[PDB]
Amino acid sequence: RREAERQAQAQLEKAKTKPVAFAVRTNVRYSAAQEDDVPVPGMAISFEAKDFLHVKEKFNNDWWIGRLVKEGCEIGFIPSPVKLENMRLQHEQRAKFTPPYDVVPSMRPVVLVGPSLKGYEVTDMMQKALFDFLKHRFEGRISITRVTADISLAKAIIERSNTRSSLAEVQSEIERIFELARTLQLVVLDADTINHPAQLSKTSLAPIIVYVKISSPKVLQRLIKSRHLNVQMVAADKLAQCPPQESFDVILDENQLEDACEHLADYLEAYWKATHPPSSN
Amino acid sequence: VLSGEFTKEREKAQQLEEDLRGYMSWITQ
């Protein structure tokens, strides 16, 4: 009867206050349709490619409960992978607690890559002053932490790193990120080896990369001289090459501490509003 | 006169150093 939809709506209203089970990353676009046989139609949460999705609980085999990561979002019926696959086979047939969901931490790590190589005092004082701002401002929320392991290494002879950074230790650090993100606190990593955003592309962590831009190589020349410069030039020129629209979420091209900190702080407040809907509490 | 202006102009039609001073100010912090 129609009562099952009412019990479903009750399960949803109960779901809205529930803590997140696990976030996932979509690999395909998906629009809602009446043929989808949504248990509670008009509540379906459609998603574009590479959309992030918090998941609260398993409503049923055909549908999971969860929410999209964006402002104004509310709890709803995120489609199950089996349902998406069944609709895929159906459309192909009509044509005549690989897979659609990559696991991601509930809170994305933030890596402030650039201007160039890490481990040198210029860029080190740069990013460190940045973490100082992020710490004193986002007090009681932000959870900055160092990662000695190279997280970029994370993905019938068993795979093994030839580097001192053992892959098992990397797995341990990844689990530490999975635990740290469970608290829904802000996270901003201080990874050492991550000189370029592309290295983290294979990671399931889905990092919030930050781009502290210096468009002019000569400026950074005079900067590093003002206090290993050449490899720093190839690296900075390399980061200059990268596509801003996708590779980076934020460009800290601002020179003074004040305005740049205002931008990145406003950004993190935007993400903070995105990750914490009123209905959750 | 303005016609002479348009005549010359019809065919006639610092960030580096600012980045230098501002980023030196950045390391200065």
Distances (CA, A) of A60 to A39, A162, A177, A191: 10, 44, 29, 39
B19 with A219: Cβ contact below 8 A: yes
A230: tokens are: 């050449």
Chain B CA closest to residue A217: B16
CB contact under 8 A, A222 and B24: yes
Q: Mind telling me how many Å the CA of A140 is from chain B's nearest CA?
A: 25
- Resolution in angstroms comes to 4.2
Residue count of chain B: 29
Return d(Cα A255, Cα A237) in angstroms, integer. Answer: 18
Question: Which pair of structure tokens corresponds to residue A2?
Answer: 């129609």
Cβ contact A209:A247 at 8 Å: yes
CB contact under 8 A, A226 and B24: yes
Q: Where are the alpha helices (DSSP H) in B1-29?
A: 2-12, 15-28
Paired tokens of A17: 């206050």
Nearest in space to A205 (alpha carbons), one of A172, A232, A174:
A174
Amino acid at B9: E
Decide the pairing of beta strands A52-57 and A22-26.
antiparallel
Residues in CB range of A36: below 8 A, 6 or more apart: A44, A79, A83, A87
State the smallest CA–CA distance between residue B14 and chain A in angstroms. 11
| Nearest Cα to Cα of residue A191 among A217, A165, A216 | A165
CA distance A63 to chain B (A): 51
Question: In sequence order, what are the residues at sequence separation of 6 or more whose Cβ sits closer than 8 angstroms to the Cβ of residue A274?
Answer: A69, A70, A71, A73
| Cβ–Cβ gap B19/A214 under 8 Å | yes
**Could you tell me which residues come within 8 angstroms of residue A103 by beta carbon, excluding any fewer than 6 positions away?**
A22, A23, A24, A25, A204
